[PDB]
Amino acid sequence: GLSDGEWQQVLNVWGKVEADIAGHGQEVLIRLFTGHPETLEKFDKFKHLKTEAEMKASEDLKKHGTVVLTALGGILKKKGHHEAELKPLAQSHATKHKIPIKYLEFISDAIIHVLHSKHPGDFGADAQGAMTKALELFRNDIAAKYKELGFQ
Numbered sequence: 001g002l003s004d005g006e007w008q009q010v011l012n013v014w015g016k017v018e019a020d021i022a023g024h025g026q027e028v029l030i031r032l033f034t035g036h037p038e039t040l041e042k043f044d045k046f047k048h049l050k051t052e053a054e055m056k057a058s059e060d061l062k063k064h065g066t067v068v069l070t071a072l073g074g075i076l077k078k079k080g081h082h083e084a085e086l087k088p089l090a091q092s093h094a095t096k097h098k099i100p101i102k103y104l105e106f107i108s109d110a111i112i113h114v115l116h117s118k119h120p121g122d123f124g125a126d127a128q129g130a131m132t133k134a135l136e137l138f139r140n141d142i143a144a145k146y147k148e149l150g151f152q
């Protein structure tokens with residue numbers, strides 16, 4: 001649950017992402033894959049990537065980064081009223097991709113890391129607080145659907 005002022009911070013930060021969605025999406029996935037190499041094994045189309053240089057050179061990884069952040073941005077713009085947008089993603093990630101909630105924690109922290117890396121000194125403590133709360137809400141509502149499905 002976020003206040004109006006917190007949502008305003010989230011959507012202000014998101015403007016930074018929308019200026020370069022592919023570059024942000026690429027770096028988020030690279031941070032996930034290099035920090036948590038077990039996550040790469042869930043992607044049949046990226047498991048061939050052995051080095052970060054190959055990851056950086058992969059145009060399909062940048063494409064998928066655009067898909068991921070476009071979906072997340074659509075959810076964030078609903079300011080919590082995201083049941084219709086979130087349900088299909090919860091279902092596909094639990095039942096088809098088999099993504100444990102832990103990996104959603106990993107990618108949430110990766111987003112925070114990338115924002116500081118690309119905007120050092122321009123991602124203030126209030127903005128980090130609000131973005132963190134928004135990603136916690138996203139993860140918590142996914143977790144509720146995971147529990148319904150019995151997925152661990």
Ligand code: HEM
Pocket residue numbers: 039040042043044045067068069071072088089092093097099103104107
């Ligand atoms: C912010 C969190 C995430 C968002 C918004 C997101 C979004 C998406 C979307 C929109 C798709 C394509 C449609 C679909 O299959 O539902 C997708 C596919 C997929 N996601 Fe995610 N995802 C997220 C996190 C993760 C994480 C953490 C993992 C694994 C560590 C993951 C694994 C996958 C896989 C394996 C696919 C299929 C890729 C393919 O072969 O095309 N997702 N995701």
